[PDB]
């Protein structure tokens, strides 16, 4: 009992209930769309900045720099000088990803400054050496290091006194005052694992460490250590620890190390043994058949129960520190720190607010202060009041206890 629209039904519904302007509107909209397409087509495509310098800094005749000094020397690592056979050196080279070769020098004005593994330059057709090069630096690991100190001090970390003291001891006192440790005959811990509920001042304490320390600080991107090409992650961690050893006093800061390696149980993880392998290399570097030098490690993690026991062992992570939820004094101090810069009344009870926010983290308290300011803004008021802070607490901490009176 439901007819189907015929030719006439459709030819009348498109022509009977109809505005006398509908056709013109439709045509004009289609024209606008087509014109937009055509305009985008004509002016489309910008000029992708290619890196050209401003004119008058260039130097033509560089076609001669391209025809002379032409040799686009490949880089090779002399892995064996074949004993030099006294005369007739007959060096060996290890052009990576390409081949091994037996070659000689060519116009090498210092045939003695060749060594083994010196990263020589080698021509394309005849593989004679032309010029040595300095050792590889691995730009990824090179930029892993922190250069600009973050603007966080040991005064914006409120509610963490014992943890700050332990971290300061382990990470700074062996660096700035070795006299006490050598006097007492105690080798201070070399390795700290900061663990606690998400958001308690772990990375904030790491930032404060980075700001205070006068020593190499290496923030390790947990994603940069995982790659394709099995063995690449292990190679990167090896080179990272090599550079750390090169530096006089180094402070590595593996953040969210739960990414790089938990338990080693593979079972169905046959495809995830590469991460376990790089974690094993990290373990070896942290403590193995070799002194580690003046390298101190920081390791931040919310969940230090998925981690490998071989990594959590107190020969690699020696001073495990827990960032617990701050007590009432800590919460009051965090409120004071975070509301120092806020435009607030002069009689707000931050002790009361710390009481109102139990089992709350420093990030939670920061959010409370921000929402108090936001409530003040949402009323055209310049000074956030105790009422606004209480509203912010109610909105952030919680979002009936009539049995607990």
């Amino acid at each position: 009992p439901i007819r189907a629209l015929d030719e006439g039904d459709i030819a009348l519904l498109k022509t009977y209930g109809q505005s006398t302007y509908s056709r013109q509107i439709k045509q004009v909209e289609d024209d606008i769309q087509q014109l937009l397409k055509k305009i985008n087509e004509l002016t489309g495509i910008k000029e992708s900045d290619t890196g050209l310098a401003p004119p008058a800094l260039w130097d033509l005749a560089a076609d001669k720099q391209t025809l002379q000094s032409e040799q686009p020397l490949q880089v090779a690592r002399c892995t064996k000088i074949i004993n030099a056979d006294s005369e007739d050196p007959k060096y060996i080279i290890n052009v990576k990803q390409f081949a091994k070769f037996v070659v000689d020098l060519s116009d090498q004005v210092a045939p003695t400054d060749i060594e083994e593994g010196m990263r020589v330059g080698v021509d394309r057709n005849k593989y004679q050496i032309h010029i040595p090069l300095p050792p590889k630096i691995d730009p990824t690991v090179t930029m892993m290091q922190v250069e600009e100190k973050p603007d966080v001090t040991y005064s914006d970390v409120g509610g963490c006194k014992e943890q700050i003291e332990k971290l300061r001891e382990v990470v700074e006192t062996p660096l700035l005052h070795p006299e006490r440790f050598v006097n007492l005959g105690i080798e201070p811990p070399k390795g700290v694992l900061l663990f606690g509920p998400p958001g308690t001042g772990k990375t904030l304490c790491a930032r404060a460490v980075a700001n205070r320390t006068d020593a190499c600080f290496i923030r390790v991107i947990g994603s940069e250590l995982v790659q394709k090409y099995v063995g690449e992650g292990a190679r990167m961690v090896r080179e990272l620890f090599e550079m750390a050893r090169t530096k006089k006093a180094c402070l590595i800061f593996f953040d969210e190390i739960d990414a790089i390696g938990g338990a080693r149980f593979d079972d169905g993880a046959g495809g995830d043994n590469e991460v376990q392998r790089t974690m094993l290399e990290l373990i070896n570097q942290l403590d193995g058949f070799d002194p580690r030098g003046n390298i101190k490690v920081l390791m931040a993690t919310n969940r230090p129960d998925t981690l490998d026991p071989a990594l959590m062992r107190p020969g690699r992570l020696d001073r495990k520190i827990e960032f617990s939820l701050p007590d009432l004094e800590g919460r009051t101090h965090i409120f004071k720190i975070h509301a120092r810069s806020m435009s607030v009344e002069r009689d707000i009870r931050f002790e009361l607010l710390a009481r109102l926010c139990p089992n709350s983290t420093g990030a939670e308290i920061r959010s409370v202060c921000t929402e108090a300011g936001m409530f003040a803004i949402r009323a055209r008021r310049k000074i956030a009041t105790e009422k606004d802070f209480l509203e912010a607490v109610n909105k952030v901490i919680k979002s009936r206890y009539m049995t607990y009176n």
């Binding site: 519904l13 900045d49 033509l60 391209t66 739960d258 079972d267 995830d272």
Partner: protein, 390 residues
């Protein structure tokens, strides 16, 4: 500091009805477009050293990863096949702009540094930009006044009036999570933000940052936030984030560990060691309870916005909005559908309107009616024992 990318969008013709005023407005848009087209045509119709410099530049220029720049005219580059060469740098290159890892350009044959190509953004992350702007303004969102206010305070006020916050030393929220049942405006309130924002909008779906190989998901997340930080202000909208971000349990498989690694990379980008620019994140979720606390943390997600099923007045707003463009008859009182205390999302209400229109068309009538709306309500909605309480 390349600058906002924005999203070009034409004006909006206020009268939705088919009348001469709408025709005049559309004709004005069209005539301006025609003048622009003819102006471009006339520019190109009325229109040496750099040409020869480009001729000297290689014809099929290759792209290689610079590594350990040396001297002032010689650097080591990579061929993107693992091999690396001790190449020279022509004077054409900028210099003082090459950095290790930068995807420099190399002459095809002689292999000399001749360009820098500082636009090596991956296609996977260039596609996820917003160049159009969906035509879903805030006037298409019935109700949700509090949710709209929250998101405006988070991603609009900090760009339109950046004096309120500096006037009290407060940093506005950098992260919002829109959580709620299946269909309540969670995606409309990102579409409206994209429509009304001057910032670079970046659509993403949590099921898209996951990649096949090892270490590629984290790399994609890092690249996404790198581009989102180069373009500023920018908003990154991760729809259905519970694709990646679910609770971080102790994995036994390898793919699960890689997915959690991607999630940790996202966490570090949201709130990590170093810093975060003016990139604001909006995640969307159906089931928030299953998300990891470290992700829902109120340093990465300052605001959490629930989108509950609409109440009566909001439902009336939805019906008004979705029947506005409909030739509603005078026999229809959109109150019987409102009052029924049944779970009705805005999506359900729109489906009800569409099905009522289809019922009218089936009955051969172009004007909907109350019986049509009743039938549509009955036939659209698909989905405690009696007397157990009371």
């Amino acid at each position: 500091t390349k600058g906002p990318d924005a999203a070009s969008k034409l004006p909006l013709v206020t009268p939705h009805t088919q009348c001469r005023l709408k025709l005049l407005k559309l004709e004005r848009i069209k005539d301006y477009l025609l003048m622009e087209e003819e102006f471009i045509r006339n520019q190109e119709q009325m229109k040496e050293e750099r040409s020869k410099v480009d001729d000297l530049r290689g014809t099929p220029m290759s792209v290689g990863t610079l590594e350990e720049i040396i001297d002032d005219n010689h650097a080591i580059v990579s061929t993107s096949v693992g091999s690396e060469h001790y190449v020279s740098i022509l004077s054409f290159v900028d210099k003082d702009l090459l950095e290790p890892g930068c995807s420099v350009l190399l002459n095809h044959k002689v292999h000399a540094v001749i360009g820098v190509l500082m636009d090596d953004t991956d296609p996977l992350v260039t596609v996820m930009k917003v160049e159009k702007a969906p035509q879903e303004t805030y006037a298409d969102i019935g109700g949700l006044d509090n949710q709209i206010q929250e998101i405006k305070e988070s991603v609009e006020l900090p760009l339109t009036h950046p004096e309120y916050y500096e006037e009290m030393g407060i940093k506005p929220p950098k992260g919002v999570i829109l959580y709620g049942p299946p269909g309540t405006g969670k995606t409309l309130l990102a579409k409206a933000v994209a429509n009304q924002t001057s910032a670079t909008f970046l659509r993403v779906v949590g099921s898209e940052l996951i990649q096949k190989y090892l270490g590629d998901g984290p790399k994609l997340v890092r690249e996404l936030f790198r581009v989102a930080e180069e373009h500023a202000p920018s908003i990154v909208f991760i729809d259905e984030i519970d694709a990646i971000g679910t609770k971080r349990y102790d994995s036994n498989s390898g793919g699960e560990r890689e997915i959690q690694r991607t999630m940790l990379e996202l966490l570090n980008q949201l709130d990590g060691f170093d810093s975060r620019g003016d990139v604001k994140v909006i995640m969307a979720t159906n089931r928030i309870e299953t998300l990891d606390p470290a992700l829902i943390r109120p340093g990465r997600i300052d605001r959490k916005i629930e989108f509950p099923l609409p109440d009566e007045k909001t439902k009336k707003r939805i019906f008004q909005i979705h029947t506005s463009r409909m030739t509603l008859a005078d026999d229809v009182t959109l109150d019987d559908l409102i009052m029924a205390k049944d779970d009705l999302s805005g999506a359900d209400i729109k489906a009800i309107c569409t099905e009522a229109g289809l019922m009218a068309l089936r009955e051969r009538r172009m004007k909907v009616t109350n019986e049509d709306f009743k039938k549509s309500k009955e036939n659209v909605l698909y989905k405690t024992p009696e007397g157990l309480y009371l």
